[PDB]
Amino acid sequence: AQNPNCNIMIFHPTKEEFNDFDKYIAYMESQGAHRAGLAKIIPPKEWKARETYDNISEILIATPLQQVASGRAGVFTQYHKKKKAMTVGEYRHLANSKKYQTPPHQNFEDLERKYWKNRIYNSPIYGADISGSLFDENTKQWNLGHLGTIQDLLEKECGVVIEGVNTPYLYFGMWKTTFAWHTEDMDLYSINYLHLGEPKTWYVVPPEHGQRLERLARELFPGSSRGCGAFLRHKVALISPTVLKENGIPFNRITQEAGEFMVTFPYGYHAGFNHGFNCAEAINFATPRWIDYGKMASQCSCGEARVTFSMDAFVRILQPERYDLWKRGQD
Ligand SMILES: O=C(O)CNC(=O)C(=O)O
Ligand SMILES: [Mg+2]
Ligand code: NI
Ligand SMILES: [Zn+2]
């Protein structure tokens, strides 16, 4: 078996190998990359997502989210308080202000220490889940707006045509902005490109060990656990690397820098934080190996997790037994 210790692998495709997305994902998996739950792909040196980022300031963040923490430094939840709309220009100015800017630090490790020590005492503002793309329409390789759709994948594998579309989202981050522990909707893959700015640190649990993370989460967030049998779908719980180590949860960490792709694999729990002002783009995707994960994905039916139009069809076709109850939560 390749990559038996489930280490995060880093890939360096040639421009030639960068031409066929599906084939390269399949190549990564042949080398065991999926075992980690997360891989990094450094694009060929000749590749660019677009010519410049000079004209992005007028993108609107219609609902910036202030991420308010509760709990203890290593074990907390976060809630999103909706803020008034602002442009990316305004947001970047806010990110750079004395109140929100990245503190002085030695290196990524020092900044990670300061994150876990101090996150809970600040409420950074996250421009998340903004439908759109920063890829130039003339970028032909690994253009997150031109991937094949999950609906087409299901049709090709399963022969059923379904409604739904699949489009990317932009994330504008600042220091301490945080993504809670989660897998993707329907345990899909995700791909994330860091277009610009400061890094993003990721933590990930190997898919083969996800249930160990879930078990610890139920012990650490016991009221959440009683409220819903899949509360990590709410995307609100944080658990520090220290706490995961204390409880013997296998995980890995890696820092993504501007110009790099990350791929999360089905049922790879991940969480992380942004180092400073940045802009990422991400989209879910599927492969034939995903199908079985989609069939087994947990679902939130308590009504908190409230997800996209397109997830309906996935649950309807892959999880017909769940469908009724899950849709009661959706409506
Ligand atoms: O970048 C973020 O804030 C969160 N991104 C992801 O969870 C992802 O790409 O799967
Ligand atoms: Mg603009
Ligand atoms: Ni994710
Ligand atoms: Zn729920």
Specify whether the CB–CB gap between 305 and 151 falls below 8 A. no
Mutate to test the pocket of ligand 1, among 238, 270, 281 (most ligand atoms within 8 A of CB): 270
Total domain count, the chain: 1
Ligand lying closest to the C-alpha of residue 173: 1
DSSP alpha helices (H): ranges in 184-310?
210-220, 222-227, 241-246, 290-296
Q: What is the DSSP string of 113-162?
A: HHHHHHGGG---EEEEEEE---S-TT--SS-TTSSPPHHHHHHHHH----
CA atoms of 49 and 163, how far apart (whole Å):
29
CA atoms of 8 and 206, how far apart (whole Å):
9
User: How many degrees, rounded to 5, is the angle at CA 269 between CA 309 and CA 34?
Assistant: 100
Q: Which two tokens stand for residue 244?
A: 């995961």
Question: Which strands, in side-by-side order, build the sheet including 200-205?
Answer: 178-182, 269-274, 200-205, 252-256
Query: Cα of 322 to ligand 4 centre, how many Å?
Result: 14
Q: Which two tokens stand for residue 267?
A: 């049922």
Place of tokens 């308590």: 302
DSSP letter (8 states) at residue 42: P
DSSP letter (8 states) at residue 8: P
Return the residue whose CA atom lies nearest to atom 4 of ligand 1.
179
Q: Which two tokens stand for residue 223?
A: 């009221």
DSSP alpha helices (H): ranges in the chain?
21-30, 88-95, 108-118, 150-158, 210-220, 222-227, 241-246, 290-296, 311-318, 320-330
Query: Cα of 56 to ligand 2 centre, how many Å?
Result: 4
Amino acid residing at 19: N
Bridge partner list, 188: none
CA atoms of 149 and 96, how far apart (whole Å):
37
Q: At what angle do helices 320-330 and 311-318 cross, to 10 degrees?
A: 150
CA atoms of 58 and 53, how far apart (whole Å):
12
CA atoms of 218 and 127, how far apart (whole Å):
29
Ligand 1 atom showing the smallest separation from residue 177 Cα:
3
DSSP letter (8 states) at residue 95: H
Phi and psi for 78 in degrees, rounded to 5? -135, 140
Mutate to test the pocket of ligand 1, among 175, 181, 192, 235 (most ligand atoms within 8 A of CB): 192
SS3 label, residue 203? strand
Q: If you compute the radius of gyration of the chain from its CA atoms, what whole number of angstroms results?
A: 19
Q: Residue 166 CB: number of other CB atoms within 10 A?
A: 18
Specify whether the CB–CB gap between 51 and 136 falls below 8 A. yes
SS3 label, residue 246? helix
Q: β-strands 38-41, 261-264: how paired?
A: antiparallel
User: How many degrees, rounded to 5, is the angle at CA 221 between CA 295 and CA 294?
Assistant: 10
Sign of CA dihedral 106, 280, 269, 131: positive
> Distance of CA 216 to CAs 181, 233, 245, Å?
12, 15, 11
Specify whether the CB–CB gap between 75 and 222 falls below 8 A. no
CA atoms of 240 and 201, how far apart (whole Å):
12
SS3 label, residue 312? helix
Return the residue whose CA atom lies nearest to atom 9 of ligand 1.
192
Amino acid residing at 144: L
Q: How would you class 293 by CB atoms within 10 Å of its CB: exposed for 0-12, middle for 13-18, buried for 19 or more? A: buried
CA atoms of 197 and 179, how far apart (whole Å):
17
Domain region containing 290: 1-331
- Residue 106, C-beta contacts closer than 8 angstroms, at least 6 positions apart: none
Task: Indicate the helix (H) or strand (E) that contains 273.
Answer: strand 269-274
- Residue 67, C-beta contacts closer than 8 angstroms, at least 6 positions apart: 78, 79, 80, 81, 123, 124, 125, 126, 176, 177, 178
CA atoms of 118 and 112, how far apart (whole Å):
10
CATH of the domain at 281: 2.60.120.650
Specify whether the CB–CB gap between 193 and 281 falls below 8 A. yes
CA atoms of 141 and 277, how far apart (whole Å):
26
Query: Greatest CA separation found in the chain?
Result: 55
Bridge partner list, 282: 169, 192
CA atoms of 256 and 194, how far apart (whole Å):
7
Ligand lying closest to the C-alpha of residue 190: 1
Place of tokens 């076709």: 317
Amino acid residing at 207: P
Specify whether the CB–CB gap between 202 and 38 falls below 8 A. yes
DSSP alpha helices (H): ranges in 228-310?
241-246, 290-296
